[PDB]
Structures are given as structure tokens and as C-alpha cells.
From a paper:
Sterol 14α-demethylase (CYP51) is the cytochrome P450 that removes the 14α-methyl group from the sterol core. The molecular evolution of cytochromes P450 and associated redox-driven oxidative catalysis remains a mystery in biology. It is widely believed that sterol 14α-demethylase (CYP51), an essential enzyme of sterol biosynthesis, is the ancestor of the whole P450 superfamily given its conservation across species in different biological kingdoms. Herein we have utilized X-ray crystallography, molecular dynamics simulations, phylogenetics and electron transfer measurements to interrogate the nature of P450-redox partner binding using the naturally occurring fusion protein, CYP51-ferredoxin found in the sterol-producing bacterium Methylococcus capsulatus.
The lanosterol-bound M. capsulatus CYP51-fx fusion protein was crystallized in the P1211 space group, and the structure was resolved to 2.5 Å resolution. The asymmetric unit consisted of four molecules of P450, the active site of each containing one molecule of lanosterol. In all the three structures the sterol 14α-methyl group lies within 4.1–4.2 Å from the heme iron, i.e., they are clearly captured in the catalytically competent orientation. Firstly, there is an additional H-bond between the sterol C3-OH and the side chain OH of Y186 (located in helix F’’) not seen in eukaryotic CYP51s. A second unique feature of the M. capsulatus CYP51 structure is that binding of the substrate does not free the side chain of E178 (helix F) from a salt bridge, an event essential to activate proton delivery in the eukaryotic CYP51 orthologs. This indicates that, in contrast with the eukaryotic CYP51s structures, the presence of the substrate alone does not complete switching the M. capsulatus CYP51 domain to an active conformation. Upon binding of the substrate all these three residues were shown to lose their contact with the heme, the side chain flipping up towards the proximal P450 surface and playing a role in the ET process.
Numbering used by the authors: 6 to 448
The structure:
């Protein structure tokens, strides 16, 4: 039929990659503003269709895996996780790799996690000093590594996390580059450093495994399970695969969540009217319950909603992609096989027909309004359809647990001008800007 509007101005051989890569959010916003719900642009030779608003986002999330696939779209992750891991695997092996974390997400170990997160938060706070100034993002990133390593991989893997590990995960994270969606292997300094980080991490996990074999005393874990893990065909998981799934599991638990946990604290200090309501329902469950339980955090609607609104305005994953395997239509336009197709939470969340006065921070979420369930394909920080986030329960839990432990025994103040705090829209995993300072004081 008719086909999508293609954006002009594409440089020769590079398409819009230069414009896109400077500020991906800004590019995608401008593309929707110009051409509406379905708009094509080029990343080098790759023809990309931005799908925005409810109807087009529905087509994206609801498409069968035989028409829209994640695999070719996410080659970027192959040099990070390793060959044959998640998206670089056959489906049957991918599903089995995802199924080996699912046990850590069940009701039973979740009662366990509340005490581990508090332990970890207090562990970093003991070394503090009564009043001072910290970088909120630098801390939150470090904290979510300990928090997610301990909870989902166990105390055994958490005991070895060091500075080498800290740098290794920053080098791995820096592998996520606008150019890397198209050409994930290039003779670049950012790529060599990610490759070196992975090789090094695989050497340290292999050594930790050699040791656990000699001791042979250590057992009872999710990491131990991986070490002993085989596929349903009885193939043994290698050190390479195990390393890949430890990386994937910290990307999931830590890299998604560092920014959005910083933002919750920033956004409450910016709007002290919501700080007072959140700090009320925290102290309220500090009073009624003893310490922070799991059911206590499940019944915290004020905080649940500030996180929900933080995710509408600061969705960390701003570009979800599929390769188009079979021609399909949206709003009566033929998106041809071989093209790629994109969802943009950052931009769909800012559509005024879906979120009246989009740029206003208003946590009217669990209220009669219900702007998030109004269209499961509107609000989409966690995606939608078959390949929706399968870890949202733990994600929301982890940041709740962290913030209402921080705000229960520290007073916070923005060390700079409240408007100074912005998102670095130069990254694909969007977090607050580079230097992000804050001040504290015990209660
Ligand atoms: C606020 C933090 C988080 C955000 C914003 C987030 C966002 C997302 C999004 C947008 C996707 C879909 C990507 C796509 O459609 O291609 C996704 C998938 C996924 N997320 Fe998360 N996530 C978060 C935290 C977590 C955590 C903590 C875990 C695990 C503990 C996790 C596990 C997963 C998994 C396994 C998938 C793949 C789903 C599948 O293909 O079956 N996420 N996440
Ligand atoms: C322990 C295991 C096997 C868990 C599986 C975790 C993965 C499915 C998650 C971890 C990080 C994750 C959320 C991510 C993404 C998808 C799902 C991932 C890979 C993607 C690739 C979505 C598209 C984004 O543009 C971007 C490239 C930033 C992210 C990176 C992190």
C-alpha cells in the first residue's frame, strides 16, 4: 500500500546517525513532531521506522516473533554478553537462559530480599559521617550492584565484587553506543575497552569457579546453580555463557535502575509537597511495622506512584527495536521486511493526548485516573506484549526498598540549583547528568 514518510537530510553513507547519535531522544521527538505516529529514518544503510502513540506502540508490542524479532536488532549486546548468550542464541537456548533467573523472582525469595537490601544500604551508610556531600548517581550505581548481586546471584558472588568489577561493568556499559546498533565491532577505543572488560570478567569468574570446586563446600545459590547448570539437551553451560548471564543479570538489576533510583530522590527534593507525602507513608510503616518488610513495601501507594511518574519522564531504555522479518502494516502503511522498527517510551510518554500536560510531574497513577493501564501500549517504560519486562516486580521493589531506607535515617538537600538536574540524553541508557551532587544529615 502506501509506505512510511522518510526523513530528509540523511548524509551520504551515514544517514541520520550523526543527528541521531548527538541526542537520540531529541531526534526521535523531532521525528514524531514532523511525521507523526510512523516515521522512517536511516542509521547508516539500516532503514528504521519510529512507532509512537497508542496504535503504533500496540502494533510493536503485540506483533508475533515471526514478524518482529529482537535478535538482529540487538547484535549490539553480543560483544557485551558474549556469543550464544540471550539475543545471539537460538530461541530454545535463550528461553532456557531467561528461565534460570525466573526462580529468583518468585514470591518466596522476595521475602528474603527486603533484609538483604537494607543490609547493603546500611553497609554503605556506616562509612558516612553524620553530615556531608556525595554524588547521588555515583552512589546509586555502586549500591544497585551490591543490591542486585546479593539478591539475584547470592552472597557468594557479591563477596567478590571489587573495584576491578566496578570498572569492568562501566567499560561494559560504555559498549552501549548509537553506532553499535549497526556495527557492534569496530576498531574503536570504547569497543576494545568493552572487549577487554569481558575477557577479564570471564577470567575472574572462571577462577572463582576453579576455587569453588576445590572448596566444594560452597553450595546453595543461583550462581552455584549456573556453575552446575546444563540445558534440557544436557549440554553443560560454559564459563563463557555463565559470565554472559552474570553480566546480563547485573545489566537487568543494576544498569536499568541506578538512574531511576537517583531520579526518585531528586524529584521528591524538587517537589517537597510529594517528599512530605512519601516521607509520611515511610515513617507510617516504620511506626506500624518494625523494620522494612516485603508486604510493608507492597502497601506504599505514594512512593509506588512517584516511581511510576519518574519512569514516565525518565524511562532509562528510550529505544526498543525489532528486525521486520515479514511485511506488516500500521495505520495503513506497509513496513517492508528487512527494515527495523522502534518504540520510544521517552517520546510516547510525552504525548499530551495520553498524558495531559505531559511535562508536569504528577504522580496521579494508582488513582481513578490510571494513565498507565488506560492503554498498556501508552505508558511503556517496561515495554509490552510477549517480550515485556519480566522483572518489573523486583525492579519497583528494589528502588522502593533503597529509597525508604535512605529517607528513614538521612535528610537530603540538592547541592545545586533544582533546574540544574537534567537527563544526559547523549546516552542510550538515560540517567541524570554526569556530576549529580546531594547533601545528607542523620535523623
Ligand atoms: C526500572 C528498571 C527496569 C526497566 C526500565 C526495565 C525495562 C525493560 C524493558 C523496556 C524491556 C523490554 C525490552 C524490549 O522490548 O526489547 C525489558 C525486558 C526485560 N527485563 Fe527489564 N527493566 C527493568 C528492570 C529489570 C530487572 C530488575 C530485571 C531482572 C531482575 C529485568 C529483567 C528483564 C528481562 C528478563 C527482560 C526480557 C523479557 C523477555 O524478552 O522475555 N528488568 N526491561
Ligand atoms: C540473567 C538474565 C539472563 C536476564 C536477562 C536480562 C536481559 C533480557 C535484559 C538485561 C538488560 C536489558 C533490559 C537491556 C535491553 C533488553 C533486555 C535486557 C538485555 C536493551 C537491549 C533494550 C534496547 C535498548 O536500546 C538497550 C540497548 C539500551 C537495552 C540494554 C539493556
Amino acid at each position: 500500500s502506501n509506505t512510511p514518510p522518510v526523513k530528509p537530510g540523511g548524509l551520504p553513507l551515514l544517514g541520520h546517525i550523526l543527528e541521531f547519535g548527538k541526542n537520540p531522544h531529541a531526534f526521535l521527538m523531532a521525528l514524531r513532531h514532523e511525521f507523526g505516529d510512523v516515521a522512517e529514518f536511516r542509521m547508516f544503510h539500516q532503514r528504521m521506522v519510529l512507532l509512537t502513540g497508542s496504535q503504533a506502540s500496540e502494533a510493536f508490542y503485540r506483533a508475533p516473533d515471526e514478524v518482529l524479532d529482537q535478535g538482529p536488532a540487538y547484535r549490539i549486546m553480543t560483544p557485551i554478553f558474549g556469543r550464544g548468550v540471550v539475543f545471539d542464541a537460538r530461541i530454545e537456548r535463550k528461553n532456557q537462559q531467561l528461565q534460570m533467573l525466573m526462580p529468583a523472582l518468585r514470591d518466596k525469595p522476595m521475602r528474603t530480599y527486603s533484609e538483604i537490601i537494607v543490609a547493603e544500604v546500611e553497609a554503605m551508610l556506616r562509612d558516612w559521617k553524620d553530615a556531608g556531600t556525595i554524588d547521588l548517581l555515583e552512589l546509586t550505581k555502586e549500591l544497585t550492584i551490591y543490591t542486585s548481586s546479593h539478591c539475584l546471584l547470592g552472597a557468594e558472588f557479591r563477596h567478590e565484587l571489587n573495584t576491578e568489577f566496578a570498572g569492568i561493568y562501566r567499560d561494559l556499559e560504555m559498549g552501549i553506543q548509537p553506532i553499535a546498533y549497526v556495527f557492534p565491532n569496530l576498531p574503536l577505543p570504547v569497543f576494545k575497552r568493552r572487549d577487554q572488560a569481558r575477557v577479564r570478567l570471564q577470567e575472574l569468574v572462571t577462577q572463582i569457579m576453579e576455587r569453588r570446586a576445590r572448596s566444594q563446600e560452597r553450595s546453595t545459590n543461583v550462581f552455584q546453580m549456573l556453575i552446575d547448570a546444563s540445558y534440557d539437551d544436557g549440554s553443560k553451560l560454559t564459563p563463557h555463557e555463565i559470565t554472559g548471564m552474570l553480566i546480563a543479570t547485573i545489566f537487568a538489576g543494576h544498569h536499568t535502575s541506578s538512574g531511576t533510583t537517583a531520579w526518585v530522590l531528586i524529584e521528591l527534593l524538587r517537589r517537597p509537597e510529594y517528599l512530605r507525602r512519601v516521607r509520611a507513608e515511610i515513617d507510617a510503616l516504620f511506626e506500624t511495622h518494625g523494620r522494612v518488610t516485603f508486604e510493608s513495601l507492597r502497601q506504599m501507594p505514594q512512593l509506588e506512584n512517584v516511581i511510576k511518574e519518574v519512569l514516565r519522564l525518565h524511562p532509562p531504555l528510550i529505544l526498543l527495536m525489532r528486525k521486520v522479518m515479514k511485511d506488516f502494516e500500521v495505520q495503513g502503511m506497509r513496513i517492508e521486511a528487512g527494515k527495523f522498527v522502534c518504540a520510544a517510551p521517552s517520546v510516547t510518554h510525552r504525548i499530551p493526548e495520553l498524558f495531559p500536560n505531559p511535562e508536569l510531574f504528577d504522580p496521579d497513577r494508582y488513582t481513578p485516573e490510571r494513565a498507565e493501564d488506560k492503554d498498556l501500549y501508552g505508558w511503556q517504560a517496561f515495554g509490552g506484549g510477549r517480550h515485556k519486562c519480566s522483572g518489573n516486580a523486583f525492579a519497583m521493589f528494589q528502588i522502593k526498598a533503597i529509597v525508604c531506607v535512605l529517607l528513614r535515617n538521612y535528610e537530603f538537600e540538592l547541592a545545586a540549583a533544582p533546574e540544574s538536574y537534567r537527563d544526559d540524553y547523549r546516552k542510550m541508557v538515560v540517567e541524570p547528568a554526569s556530576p549529580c551532587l546531594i547533601r545528607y544529615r542523620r535523623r
